[PDB]
Each structure stands twice: as structure tokens, then as C-alpha cells.
Design a protein around this nucleic acid. Sequence first.
RNA 1: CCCAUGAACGAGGAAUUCCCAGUAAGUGCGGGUCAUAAGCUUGCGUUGAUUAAGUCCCUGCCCUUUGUACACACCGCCCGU
RNA 2: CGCAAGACGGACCAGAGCGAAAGCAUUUGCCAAGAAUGUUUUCAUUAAUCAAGAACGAAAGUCGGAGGUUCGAAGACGAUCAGAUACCGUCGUAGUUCCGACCAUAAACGAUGCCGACCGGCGAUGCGGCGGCGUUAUUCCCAUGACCCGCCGGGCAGCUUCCGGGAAACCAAAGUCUUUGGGUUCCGGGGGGAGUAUGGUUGCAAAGCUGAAACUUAAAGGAAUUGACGGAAGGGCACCACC
Lengths: 25, 136, 98, 213, 62
Amino acid sequence: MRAKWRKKRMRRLKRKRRKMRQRSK
Amino acid sequence: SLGPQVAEGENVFGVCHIFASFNDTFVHVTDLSGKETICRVTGGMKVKADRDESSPYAAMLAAQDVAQRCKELGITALHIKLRATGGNRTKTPGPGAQSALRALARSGMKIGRIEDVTPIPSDSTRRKGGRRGRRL
Amino acid sequence: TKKRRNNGRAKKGRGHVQPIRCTNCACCVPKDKAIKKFVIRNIVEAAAVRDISEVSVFDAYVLPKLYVKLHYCVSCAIHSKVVRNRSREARKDRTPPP
Amino acid sequence: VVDPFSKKDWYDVKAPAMFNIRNIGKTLVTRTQGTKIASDGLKGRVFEVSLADLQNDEVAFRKFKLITEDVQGKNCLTNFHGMDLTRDKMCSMVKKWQTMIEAHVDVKTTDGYLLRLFCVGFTKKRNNQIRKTSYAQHQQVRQIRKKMMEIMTREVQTNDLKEVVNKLIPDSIGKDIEKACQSIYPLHDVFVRKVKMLKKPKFELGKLMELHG
Amino acid sequence: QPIKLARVTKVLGRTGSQGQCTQVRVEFMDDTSRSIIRNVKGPVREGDVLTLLESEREARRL
RNA sequence: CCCAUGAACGAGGAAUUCCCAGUAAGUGCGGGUCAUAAGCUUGCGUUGAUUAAGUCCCUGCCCUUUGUACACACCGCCCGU
RNA sequence: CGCAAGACGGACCAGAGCGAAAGCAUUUGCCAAGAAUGUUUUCAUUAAUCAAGAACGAAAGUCGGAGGUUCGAAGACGAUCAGAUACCGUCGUAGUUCCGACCAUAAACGAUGCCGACCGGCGAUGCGGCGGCGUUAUUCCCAUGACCCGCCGGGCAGCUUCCGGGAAACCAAAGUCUUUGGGUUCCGGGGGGAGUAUGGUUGCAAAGCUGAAACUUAAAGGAAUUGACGGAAGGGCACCACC
């Protein structure tokens, strides 16, 4: 796992967490 | 198809625009102008095979066919304007350049003045292929 | 480990130079980084100068030359055997080969 | 089912009286077959003529663009359309470890010809010089360029086409710049590298027949 | 073009992909002061005569 | 051993082996095995050439410089769903 | 042959210059700015580094216009392959260009904070000044340029060395360090978890800055050496290689 694509997967995973936390607000 | 000039002394000059790319070779005789073309042959006209359109043999056959059609209309000599692909792309003439020029020298024609007329930019547009280039 | 002291390029007080496009590929190479040749070359090699001299209209015609400046990326240059890997002592020789 | 080169007449090409060697070559045209006229479709052909072909004994690297301004009959009479340099020579001049200096001048002659002269110049490594670099200061370069621009306006604005072309056949402009700029920076390979035609006046046949004796 | 004879004055090296061709300095025994370098198959020694079916090629040196 | 029967095979596809002088190949004869015994092997003569005196192209091997996250060592190491 | 539009400024172009950095390359003009040198000019400690706070900040990305030449994420298609949502090729939207606002990150690197002193040598080079035989241009000499020979200061660097340092590679700084203290800011504390969760804050958004713990693990790593290997370069050898 290249450290750039690790950082890209952790951003997408965060971006899905901010998408799913928003739906209770 | 008669240049009505005198028997011996005077030569009927033309000019052949030799355009040698890496994947085709053109031999294109015109008048002193260039605006009136006499004969044109490429490499792909002579060879029934797409890979060797630029091959020196294709350019030899081309130049021989031109120099035959050129001697018919009464053109004795040729100036040469050698060309490479140029622009943002490669400025080296392809492998058909020296074969085509040698060929029409051997095929009876007389050689005037030679020069490169390749489209060399001051600075052109962004060249094809990416940042990282043509990977292979 | 730092292999080259200059870092394989020739900027010391810039921080940026303009990218050239490698002639072989289209790779963008810093100008200072690129391996540059200046090829002067006779339009005909050896076999065709024999023929032109005889089939020339003119009196002892000097043949014209074809002035290219080739810019290579490090990968293209090594593959096409323009430059070449050297021993760590012999790397430091900036003299061009004869 | 028909040879198209059987419909062509080979018309001869004449250079104006400011050149020693007269005729350049021949150029085939179609015969007046319908609406299109030979002479009208023949009146815009540009001949790239090496100066060694055009003058008796001069340098070969200089080229002259010559348009067929009018046709009398079996004679394409030509007029000046631009000096150029063979890129063989132009590239040969440009070498490293010296300053290349250029100057363009959008200028007009006495008659209604508008030219765009391009000068070029290269700083000279002196006879006793040990230093490799051989460069000029930026103010030295633009003093040279200001001189180039002054000298080319001086030698075009006062005289007509025929006289400026007789100054272009030698290096009368190029050698005068090379003389004048010695006090600034001694530069050696000093030529006018290109002249470009921008405006011509309305065509007078009496003007062209004065160009042809 | 005629079929001419040339004498081997010096056998330079052994060229060819498998080293299968002697590269040879040939002297034209017709025009006795014209000499070219030329590739030759089979065993060649100095001072044996080659039959050239053309005398206008010239090989590229080692 | 005798008589009789008288099959394929008309010079061998891709691929591939061995060999440079008394050599290759042809040709037989000994030795080993052997109660019975050579289409094998190991020796011996006999007859006796073509080609080559070269190269790193292919196949291997060995160098020198280089790169390496390999070290029972590239059949190595190793990454993610 | 012309014409148009939009990009970009080849060659000259350099271990050259300038800029705090990002960065900066056609000509000419205007606008302010700047280092360095020169100074028997002036003020006379006005300084150095810096929480908070502030300016600038490659590319990509965002919002509104203007433009759209080339190139080209996404996309469609043709190839290769077992597959090939790759590499190759033909097209090709966003973008790439300009203006106005965001964005605040890069292997933003010299992976090397800034100011000051001291400690070998040598040849260069850039800028400014100083001195000196001689060639050369303005010819009509002056003084200015072009060279040549040195000196000084500041600059990008270079070579060499048992200064000395360092795990070593290497470094005139990464030296003057157990013989340890010139000033000062930021910052690290085994590897993961993780630049994650969570709270705050900035942003239109993308995302930025700040930022843990539970848990897990005996190594992860740095430099160098020897081997082995390579689809890297070169050299050599063999009819168990070739010709």
C-alpha cells in the first residue's frame, strides 16, 4: 500500500463518515 | 509534357519536398514555386504492408518512381527541401530521408541545393503524451 | 543515502527551472536535469555523398548540415545508451568523454 | 483517361535588373481553359532563390523570395518579396558561450513598400581572451539593439526597393552594424537574417518595367 | 556496370554478427591507386584477388 | 540354423544432438555381461573426408561497474480487497 | 499563397543572474522597488530571534464571468492480455489560458531555522570598486567600452586536504562537543494504531489547522560491508555455444 493511496482511502472513508453523521442532524 | 527549352546547355530545375516522418516517407517534386506539383509518391503507395511505410526501401522505390515520372515531363535537376515531422514533435528526419535522396541521385536526376525546411517552432503548443510521457 | 551532491541536476540558486519535453518520450524534465546533446550532422552519411558529388549541378558543392539539440529524460538517455551508470569515484568526473 | 500535364505551358521566370544572372527557371501553368486565366492564377507564385544562383559570385546561404508581380508573355517578371537565411547558416551561427543579439524594425521605404528587417549579432571571443564565457551586460546588448534599429531605419527610410536590395546583396547593413557596435561590444557574425514584405502600393507596370531595365 | 578485380593489400578485422566476414582493405588492380574497405565471406589472406560484381559500395569499419 | 511368409519405409514436421585430423562418418574385431549371450557399453584397428583457425548473434558460465526492501538469498521478498 | 484565434517564448540558456519564498526568459516604454559595491555623508544602539497577530504562497480543486489553440483527468472506442475498469493508439467533457473572489497545501528539498565570531589552501565565476605592461574600437586623442594581469568586498558554486566532526555516507560546515554554556525560535522521544476518533476552528465545497486513547508489537529503521540476484552497463570464454 503506497502511503498516498492509503491517505486517499482514509479521506474517502472520512468523507463517508461525514456523509452518515450528517443524516442525524 | 514538354519543357520547350534548348537541347544541351540549360537544365530544367524543380524542387522535391522530401518529408521523412518515422512512420511514413514522402518524395514530392514540384516546380521552382512549389505551388505547381509535378509528381508525388509516398512509402505506403509502394509497399503492401503498414509497418514498413517509412522503411528506406519504400522511400527508394518512391524516389525511383518520381525520378522516372520527373524525367518524362523533362525535369533534369532538383533542388531539395528535406523535412522532418517538426512542430512540437521530433526534428530528426526519418529513415527514408537518405535512401530517397540517394535513390533519385542514382536514378539519373541532378542535385541543386539542399536545406532543412522542418517546421521548427520558437515555442509551440503542449506536445502529445502526458506529464510522465509515453510509458512502455 | 544522498547519491549525487548536485542532486543529479544543475540548479544551485534557483528553486525552479522550466520543464523541457524529452524528445524520445514526451516526459517533462527540468532544463538543468535533462541530458542535452547538440548533434551537428551531414544530411547524407557516407554512401550518398559519393553519389551527390557526382550528380551535383555545381562546382565542388559543400553539403549542408542538420543542427538538432536533443533533450533526453534520464530513463530515455540510459535506455538509448547516451549516458551510462559509472563507479561512485568515476561519477564525480565532469569531463566529457573524448 | 487523360494526361493533365498535356494542358500545361512552361513559362520562363525573369529576375529584376538589380541581379546579375537573369533567368531563375521555368514553371508550368494550365492553359486558359474556361473562366480561370493562366496569368491571374500565376501572379502569386513565390520563388525561394539562393543568391549564388541569382548573383554571379556572392555567398550562397542568403535566399530571396520573388513573387511573379505581372506576366508580359512567356515571361514571369518577378519583384522582391523577402530576404531569408538558410537555416544551415542560421543554426551554424548560434553557438553556446556568447550573447546572441536580435533587433526587428517595422520600416517604410521612399515609395509605398513597408519592410520588417530582422538583424542578428553574436559577441566575439577576443584574440588574447582566456575567459570562456564571452557575454555582454544587458545595457550593452540593448545599446547594440538600439544601434541596429537606428542603422536599419537610416539605410531604408532614405532610399527605394532597388537600392536597399543592392545593400542586402552585400552585407552593407550587417558590416556597418558590426563596425558601429565595436565601441559597445565587438560582435562578429552580424547579418540581416530576414526581410519581410508587409505592404506594397497599387501595381504600376511602368514601375516593374523600370525594375526590368 | 562492369565486373572488376581488386587485390587484398590488408585484412583489417573480423566483423559480422557471428564474426563470419573478414573486413578487408582492397586495391583496384585496374585503377592502381584507388583503395576501399570491404566485407568478404570465407577465409581471406593478404594478396588474393576478389571478383567485385560492383566496385561502388564501401563497408563500415570496426 | 533350414525352407516359407515378404509389413512400414520413396531421406523424415516443429524441434534438436555430436564433432575440427588419422578427427567425423563408414567398417568390422576383442573385453565386460556370459551355463546359454550384444541391437548395450568399454577398448582396438581398418577406410578416411567436408568445413573452420573465427565470434559473442543464440545457449550457458566467469568477470568488472552498478541497483536492491534479497540473505536456506528471485522458486527471494511482498501489497491490498 | 493567404487569413483567423488561442496557447508558448526554442536555439542563445550556463552547476549563470534576480527574488523572502512560491517563482522569474521576445521587443520597447512607463511605474515604483531592491541587493552589492563606493563614501574622511548622516542618526547614534535605533539591535538579533520571536507566543499572539499579519503578508505572500507551485500545481491541483472551488464560485462567477471572458475565451476555448494544443494537451487532456472522467468518458466512449480500438489494441495487448487468461483478464487489462493499465501501460499503447484514435477521439474526448471538466480543466489547461485571462479577469474577479476563494483554497493554504507539495519530495514547498539544500529533506540542512535565523544572527554573530573564529578555524587550511587553490582555480574559476557573477556584481561593484581599485591598480597595472600591452592589443583593440570610437580615430583626431581624450575618456569610455572589448580583452589581458592582479587587489578588495558581498554572491551562486567548484576542486583539494589527517583543521576538525560524524554510525558512516559524507560535511570548510553537518567543524570550534564529556576539554560539554555566543544569542534565539520551532520541533523529536521504539514501530504500529494514526495524522485515526472525538471536540474546537477555517472553508461554498473539497478539505486545512489543532489532535488523542484503547489496543497491538521486539523490533521498525539509518549508514556501510560481503554475497546472491536483475528483464541495468561493459568485458571475457566454450562445437556439453554459435558461425
